[PDB]
Amino acid sequence: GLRHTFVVADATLPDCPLVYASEGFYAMTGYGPDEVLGHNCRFLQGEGTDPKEVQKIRDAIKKGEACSVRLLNYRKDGTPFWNLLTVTPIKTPDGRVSKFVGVQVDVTS
Ligand SMILES: *[C@@]12=NC3=[C]C([C])=C([C])[C]=C3N([C][C]([O])[C]([O])[C]([O])[C]OP([O])([O])=O)C1=NC(=O)[N]C2=O
Numbered sequence: 001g002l003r004h005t006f007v008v009a010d011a012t013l014p015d016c017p018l019v020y021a022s023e024g025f026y027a028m029t030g031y032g033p034d035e036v037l038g039h040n041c042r043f044l045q046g047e048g049t050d051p052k053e054v055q056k057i058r059d060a061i062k063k064g065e066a067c068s069v070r071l072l073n074y075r076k077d078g079t080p081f082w083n084l085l086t087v088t089p090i091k092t093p094d095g096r097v098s099k100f101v102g103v104q105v106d107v108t109s
Contacts, residue, residue, distance in 0.1 A: 002105060009100035013041050016061060016100055028106060030076030044073035057087060064097045076077045082108045
């Protein structure tokens with residue numbers, strides 16, 4: 001299939017830090033687990049990232065609904081790539097959101 005990555009965000013903490021990321025996420029972004037785990041994914045953003053699309057993610061996270069946006073992210077070396085982000089809320093049996101899982105595809109073509 002297509003080349004994608006995978007991360008898990010812990011919604012029980014107020015800012016949804018990352019608790020697990022697939023090896024492709026580390027290889028794609030240039031960042032390692034010692035600089036990714038425990039942080040919000042927004043470190044990938046930079047100057048050309050649209051504050052409108054970023055707002056669609058923030059609202060969906062606060063509302064506990066899924067979202068799919070096209071962002072401009074930056075590797076550790078500062079080079080830009082285009083990220084097709086899709087975040088999905090994972091809820092407990094009582095309806096509360098516990099984790100946020102996101103698939104990231106580099107659609108720079
Ligand atoms: C990021 N991937 C990513 C993966 C998951 C599972 C979640 C929940 C979020 C992301 N983001 C967005 C980021 O964490 C944050 O939610 C946004 O910056 C919007 O919130 P604020 O209020 O801080 O602006 C991802 N953002 C990226 O740029 N790249 C991803 O791969």
